[PDB]
Design a protein around this ligand. Structure first.
Ligand code: HEM
Ligand code: HEM
Ligand code: HEM
Ligand code: HEM
Lengths: 142, 146, 142, 146
């Protein structure tokens, strides 16, 4: 449940992070596959699942991209995220609990690349927002 | 895990009253309906779209007996469940690519079907021992995911 | 995200279950404390935490009561659940993850007392509703 | 747990670069701010209401050093973490009544603070070994809850 303060924090932090989003995506996905190997089960067709592999680096920028898009949809994430939910829900069939794992690996990468900017205050707001994007994506599962 | 003889007796007593032929199918089919994303592994089984479809699919029922039958070995090796399911955990991780969190909702649903069939004889105390056992089984099934 | 079908299922099942709600509450709480002993940490002032104890039996009817009230608020659970959220969030400080544990113990008790009525169809809808009551209650935490 | 010598080296290498005085306070205070319901145990510490309050509370900082200092024993007993924290797990369960899921968000937040302080030297591979270790520690802290 994003408050207006949460949204202003996410927006002030995001403007500052937007240039490295592909790097951030690539690395958060990479971190998730390596530290949480149960998520590797969804990418078994990919040639290389290692941190820094092409598949990984490409797919991570795609995921970060969708999240950056979500910063603009914070008023209606459920409605904004509708089509990607549908996809995750009916095509990919990704257990929703994996959304929180990704989220945690995104925070770890943000801390790493933006340790000074990634304050407690920034931390709590972005965590809420990532939880709300997870919820929006999970919405159409059943 | 460290199990007492009384715990061991409880689990064998519960499994003694379990009808594999009735409980597997029900448990498996209820998982596919309540957590519909688990259907993604059952493509070759034909139509697992709707409850009605799910509940009459023969391949579902057959598989339910298989999955539930495999618990017999857990039930009979309470000292070393990890090692008894090592191999099974590797086919799930490497050949079937089943998300291991899926073993957790199955455990919950099985427990729910068992409660429906045992009724009041499924006491809180029995359910507590059954849940400790389920947790070791789930952990064992997800242990070879690397 | 309750659909109208979900709501009609919850409502048809609830009318059938409403007479045994105190029994159901008492037993689901009892089951949770005994099978999930980590939740016992919130009731350490209570004299007896055993299944069938007074504290337990009384508190379980109170919780079931609030849920039965939620069946009437399904259109706006967040708004309907607002005051109880506040309580759980600021007074009690109950980790939200315990809401799903309770929910699972409620389904187990429903299966037990209403095995014929507690079909797969009833199962999925009530699970969604319990998840939505959990979400509503968790809403004001942070 | 079964640990390789390389794993053991990784964990000791990470803990070697950890400054208990900086990381405990930060980790503990960030937990209280991001998961504000954990403040319910820190009543005697005075005002732990706001970030600003939380981040300047001396009792918080002191406690952060204590909690983080206690990991040294995990770091030095990688063969038997369960047994090393048995006693600690019982005071948490029986005297402090800390919900054990709280150990899980602490582990996540600590990891996040460590990443901020190590930067790129906290590689995915290192984070994977640190996460295996965190999981045994968390499990050990919640093991005496009955
Ligand atoms: C929670 C944030 C997530 C977002 C915003 C997100 C977004 C996306 C997008 C935008 C695409 C496809 C892009 C396009 O077709 O234009 C995609 C595909 C996919 N995502 Fe998600 N995703 C998320 C989480 C996850 C997680 C946690 C997993 C697995 C655990 C996952 C697994 C996949 C897979 C397997 C594909 C397609 C695979 C392929 O292209 O080979 N996603 N996701
Ligand atoms: C409760 C834990 C489970 C046990 C003990 C178990 C047991 C088994 C066994 C004994 C097999 C036979 C194949 C072989 O010998 O390698 C099998 C195959 C399979 N299981 Fe698991 N299973 C469990 C949970 C799950 C879950 C939760 C899912 C899906 C959501 C699943 C999906 C499958 C599939 C798709 C196959 C292969 C189907 C086929 O080709 O016939 N299993 N399982
Ligand atoms: C998710 C569904 C839940 C609902 C609808 C619910 C509802 C309530 C209500 C209505 C009250 C107080 C009644 C009144 O003052 O009139 C209450 C109190 C309380 N609840 Fe919740 N609750 C829920 C879950 C939980 C869970 C899962 C826990 C613990 C793990 C919990 C712990 C407590 C405690 C400790 C109290 C007060 C204790 C006391 O009176 O001594 N609740 N709850
Ligand atoms: C990461 C795992 C943790 C470790 C290793 C740890 C370690 C310790 C230690 C060494 C003590 C000193 C008291 C004694 O000797 O009995 C302690 C006390 C305490 N811990 Fe834990 N702790 C952990 C997690 C937590 C968490 C997550 C919380 C709360 C959310 C918490 C709350 C407390 C409190 C309230 C006290 C007593 C305060 C006092 O009277 O000074 N601990 N902890």
């Amino acid at each position: 449940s994003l408050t207006a303060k949460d949204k202003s924090v996410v927006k002030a932090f995001w403007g500052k992070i937007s240039g490295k989003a592909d790097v951030v995506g690539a690395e958060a996905l990479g971190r998730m596959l390596t530290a949480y190997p149960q998520t590797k089960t969804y990418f078994s067709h990919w040639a290389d699942l290692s941190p820094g592999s092409g598949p990984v680096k490409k797919h991570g920028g795609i995921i970060m991209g969708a999240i950056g898009k979500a910063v603009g949809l914070m008023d209606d994430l459920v409605g904004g995220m509708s089509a990607l939910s549908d996809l995750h829900a009916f095509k990919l069939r990704v257990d929703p609990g994996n959304f929180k794992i990704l989220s945690h690996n995104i925070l770890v990468t943000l801390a790493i690349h933006f340790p000074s900017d990634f304050t407690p205050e920034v931390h709590i707001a972005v965590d809420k927002f990532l939880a709300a994007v997870s919820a929006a994506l999970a919405d159409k599962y059943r | 895990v460290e199990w007492t003889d009384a715990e061991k007796s409880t689990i064998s007593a519960v499994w003694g009253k379990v009808n594999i032929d009735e409980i597997g199918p029900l448990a498996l089919a209820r998982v596919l309906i309540v957590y519909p994303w688990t259907q993604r592994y059952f493509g070759s089984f034909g139509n697992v779209s709707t409850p009605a479809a799910i509940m009459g699919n023969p391949k579902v029922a057959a598989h339910g007996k298989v999955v539930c039958g495999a618990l017999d070995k857990a039930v009979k090796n309470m000292g070393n469940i990890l090692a008894t399911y090592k191999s099974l955990s590797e086919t799930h991780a490497n050949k079937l690519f089943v998300d291991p969190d899926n073993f957790r909702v199955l455990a919950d649903v099985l427990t729910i079907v068992i409660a429906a069939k045992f009724g009041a004889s499924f006491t809180p105390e029995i359910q507590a021992t059954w849940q400790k056992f389920m947790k070791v089984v789930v952990a064992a099934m997800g242990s070879r995911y690397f």
